[PDB]
Amino acid sequence: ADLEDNMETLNDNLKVIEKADNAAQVKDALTKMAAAAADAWSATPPKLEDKSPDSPEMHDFRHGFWILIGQIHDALHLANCGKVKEAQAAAEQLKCTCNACHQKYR
Amino acid sequence: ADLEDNMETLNDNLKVIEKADNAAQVKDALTKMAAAAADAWSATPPKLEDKSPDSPEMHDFRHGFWILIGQIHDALHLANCGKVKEAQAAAEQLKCTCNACHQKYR
Amino acid sequence: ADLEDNMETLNDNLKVIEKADNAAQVKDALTKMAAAAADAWSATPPKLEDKSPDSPEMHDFRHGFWILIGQIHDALHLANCGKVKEAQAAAEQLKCTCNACHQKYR
Amino acid sequence: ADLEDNMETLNDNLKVIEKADNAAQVKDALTKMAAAAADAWSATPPKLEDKSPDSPEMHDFRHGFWILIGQIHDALHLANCGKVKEAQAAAEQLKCTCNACHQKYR
Ligand code: HEM
Ligand code: HEM
Ligand code: HEM
Ligand code: HEM
């Protein structure tokens, strides 16, 4: 449940996908990432505890996970069609979104 | 005109967005990026020179511009509404799309 | 609460949007739709009752809500900016997502 | 080039996809649709000739094709992974977008 637990999962599985050598292994990893992203979406980070749940910052915070999940879902779709390398390249790119939210809210 | 020229407009303008003080500045920079992106769409990069107009590759390449185009269009909605900082955050996220395309194709 | 209840909120509110005279009306209706959509996300429809939590099906189903969520969020940006008619047009387009999910899963 | 030519192509190929019984035939059709949508995107419909090229109506007109192409690109991706029925269902759904733009601008 904890935001510091979803982030762990997110970081771990990224490593798993990088080392993967087949589609099934990538798919399995993308799925846990998807689930951790989904769960995180509903959280309040230490930096935004003082902000309106309805604030522009929390709509954006939640919107960053919306973007992530989307990109996880595209990566997953590549792995489901056997396209392993394309799906690992997509997972690699995920880090830019991770960073763009970390820069504003971590 | 050129692909290279399209890319310069894109890169110069992101900087103008980062440094902007007001909405009009960001709006003007996004409009020039929309026009560059649209123009770049029909280009063949030197690394896909030998591939068919209908290669998985050229379709993927065009699609990255489709994404950039939608992003810049959303940033623009923000700037037209005077939301300067959220437009600048949108530009930051936009970089990821730049980079993903450059990883595969530059 | 229920899936059925989530769907009613969704349907009632689209009507309020169509009939609205001003931005505040549309904004309020979109906020109630955002909340319904988020809640509906975790549900299992009676037609996917026998399928795994990780079936191509349940992933596809969740993804339709992901789309609706992003659409309603964009409509909301419009309404927060006072763009009443463009928000109402956004709601019209939004119906397609409703229908696509209902074709596969209702 | 003509807008009345892209619309024809768009309508014809839809019929082709409905009757298709295999992935290659669907893919071929989705590709011509993609090309006709791309070309249409740059046009001025009889109803908007008097509007600013920069108007909210023309940003939206162009934005309707952006949505279409996106959905064509997802349909295509299903066909490229052998998923024929899912890709024909996706092509069927395209009609709701066709209609939502026709309702405002045809
Ligand atoms: C694959 C994508 C991501 C990865 C691998 C990842 C990884 C991490 C890691 C390892 C930490 C803990 C670092 C520390 O203890 O100092 C962290 C924290 C954090 N992350 Fe992420 N992250 C990702 C995406 C995101 C996104 C999209 C958001 C926001 C929308 C986000 C928001 C945050 C915040 C606010 C913290 C600080 C946690 C705290 O103060 O308890 N992360 N992330
Ligand atoms: C706003 C985001 C973007 C920025 C800021 C950007 C920036 C640049 C710059 C400055 C260059 C050439 C100079 C150099 O070597 O650095 C370049 C080259 C290139 N870009 Fe981009 N770019 C962006 C988006 C894209 C996208 C979305 C695509 C494809 C969909 C793309 C494809 C390419 C290719 C293929 C080249 C090399 C072309 C050549 O060698 O002539 N870029 N980019
Ligand atoms: C704003 C758009 C939507 C509207 C207006 C809407 C409307 C409705 C209504 C009024 C019902 C139940 C009553 C009836 O039979 O008509 C319903 C049922 C249902 N909807 Fe939606 N809906 C929307 C979006 C969605 C989406 C996005 C999904 C999936 C991603 C979905 C999945 C379902 C399912 C599975 C049922 C049947 C549930 C049952 O039998 O208990 N709907 N919808
Ligand atoms: C698969 C999707 C689509 C199909 C099958 C389709 C089909 C058609 C057809 C058959 C016509 C001609 C009807 C007549 O002569 O009376 C037409 C016209 C038109 N379409 Fe579409 N359409 C699609 C999508 C769109 C979209 C997305 C837009 C706008 C963004 C659009 C804008 C228009 C307009 C403005 C006209 C009137 C043409 C004129 O006055 O010359 N269509 N379309």
Side-chain angles (χ1 to χ4, degrees):
Chain A
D2 203 330
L3 188 72
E4 223 187 59
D5 279 314
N6 305 313
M7 291 311 149
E8 290 318 327
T9 291
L10 244 16
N11 200 68
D12 284 352
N13 277 108
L14 214 39
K15 275 78 173 291
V16 171
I17 288 156
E18 161 175 330
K19 323 295 174 147
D21 62 40
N22 68 95
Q25 175 176 34
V26 169
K27 171 187 152 99
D28 229 289
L30 287 163
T31 317
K32 287 153 177 145
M33 283 188 89
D39 203 72
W41 185 92
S42 83
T44 319
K47 309 205 155 170
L48 303 169
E49 306 178 356
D50 63 329
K51 260 42 165 90
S52 208
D54 192 37
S55 70
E57 296 90 345
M58 284 288 297
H59 277 113
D60 183 49
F61 179 91
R62 283 192 289 281
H63 186 254
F65 287 111
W66 183 86
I67 290 174
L68 197 65
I69 291 164
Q71 296 184 280
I72 290 165
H73 165 263
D74 294 336
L76 203 46
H77 244 119
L78 298 163
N80 272 131
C81 305
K83 295 146 203 190
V84 191
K85 284 197 136 91
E86 18 292 283
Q88 295 177 108
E92 179 67 2
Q93 97 171 255
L94 248 19
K95 292 200 285 266
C96 184
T97 301
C98 304
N99 298 351
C101 176
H102 293 168
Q103 215 44 36
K104 307 171 315 199
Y105 305 126
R106 177 181 140 180
Chain B
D2 207 313
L3 183 57
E4 88 176 318
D5 296 309
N6 293 336
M7 289 300 146
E8 292 306 339
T9 307
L10 254 350
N11 197 49
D12 284 353
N13 280 107
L14 211 35
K15 187 50 73 153
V16 156
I17 290 149
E18 178 192 335
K19 296 302 174 163
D21 284 320
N22 73 55
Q25 297 172 326
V26 176
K27 175 196 174 106
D28 168 79
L30 295 162
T31 308
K32 292 172 171 137
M33 294 174 87
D39 192 21
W41 193 82
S42 66
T44 322
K47 293 198 165 156
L48 301 178
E49 267 183 37
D50 59 326
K51 274 73 188 305
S52 172
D54 281 358
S55 57
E57 286 94 32
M58 272 289 284
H59 260 105
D60 173 36
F61 182 84
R62 284 189 275 266
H63 180 250
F65 281 126
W66 175 89
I67 293 191
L68 198 77
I69 291 175
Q71 300 181 302
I72 289 162
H73 154 112
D74 302 335
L76 222 17
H77 273 116
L78 290 173
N80 289 157
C81 296
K83 282 167 180 178
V84 167
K85 297 216 171 308
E86 28 283 273
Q88 290 166 136
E92 226 47 79
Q93 184 51 219
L94 196 70
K95 302 190 161 157
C96 299
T97 314
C98 312
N99 306 340
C101 179
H102 289 202
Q103 205 47 34
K104 283 173 284 171
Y105 303 122
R106 196 196 85 210
Chain C
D2 207 313
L3 183 57
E4 88 176 318
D5 296 309
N6 293 336
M7 289 300 146
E8 292 306 339
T9 307
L10 254 350
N11 197 49
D12 284 353
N13 280 107
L14 211 35
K15 187 50 73 153
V16 156
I17 290 149
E18 178 192 335
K19 296 302 174 163
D21 284 320
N22 73 55
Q25 297 172 326
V26 176
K27 175 196 174 106
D28 168 79
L30 295 162
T31 308
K32 292 172 171 137
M33 294 174 87
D39 192 21
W41 193 82
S42 66
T44 322
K47 293 198 165 156
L48 301 178
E49 267 183 37
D50 59 326
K51 274 73 188 305
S52 172
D54 281 358
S55 57
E57 286 94 32
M58 272 289 284
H59 260 105
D60 173 36
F61 182 84
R62 284 189 275 266
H63 180 250
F65 281 126
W66 175 89
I67 293 191
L68 198 77
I69 291 175
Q71 300 181 302
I72 289 162
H73 154 112
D74 302 335
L76 222 17
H77 273 116
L78 290 173
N80 289 157
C81 296
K83 282 167 180 178
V84 167
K85 297 216 171 308
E86 28 283 273
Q88 290 166 136
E92 226 47 79
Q93 184 51 219
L94 196 70
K95 302 190 161 157
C96 299
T97 314
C98 312
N99 306 340
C101 179
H102 289 202
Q103 205 47 34
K104 283 173 284 171
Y105 303 122
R106 196 196 85 210
Chain D
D2 203 330
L3 188 72
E4 223 187 59
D5 279 314
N6 305 313
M7 291 311 149
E8 290 318 327
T9 291
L10 244 16
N11 200 68
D12 284 352
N13 277 108
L14 214 39
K15 275 78 173 291
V16 171
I17 288 156
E18 161 175 330
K19 323 295 174 147
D21 62 40
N22 68 95
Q25 175 176 34
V26 169
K27 171 187 152 99
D28 229 289
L30 287 163
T31 317
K32 287 153 177 145
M33 283 188 89
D39 203 72
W41 185 92
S42 83
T44 319
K47 309 205 155 170
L48 303 169
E49 306 178 356
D50 63 329
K51 260 42 165 90
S52 208
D54 192 37
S55 70
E57 296 90 345
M58 284 288 297
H59 277 113
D60 183 49
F61 179 91
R62 283 192 289 281
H63 186 254
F65 287 111
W66 183 86
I67 290 174
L68 197 65
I69 291 164
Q71 296 184 280
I72 290 165
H73 165 263
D74 294 336
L76 203 46
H77 244 119
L78 298 163
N80 272 131
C81 305
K83 295 146 203 190
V84 191
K85 284 197 136 91
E86 18 292 283
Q88 295 177 108
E92 179 67 2
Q93 97 171 255
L94 248 19
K95 292 200 285 266
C96 184
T97 301
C98 304
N99 298 351
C101 176
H102 293 168
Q103 215 44 36
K104 307 171 315 199
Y105 305 126
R106 177 181 140 180

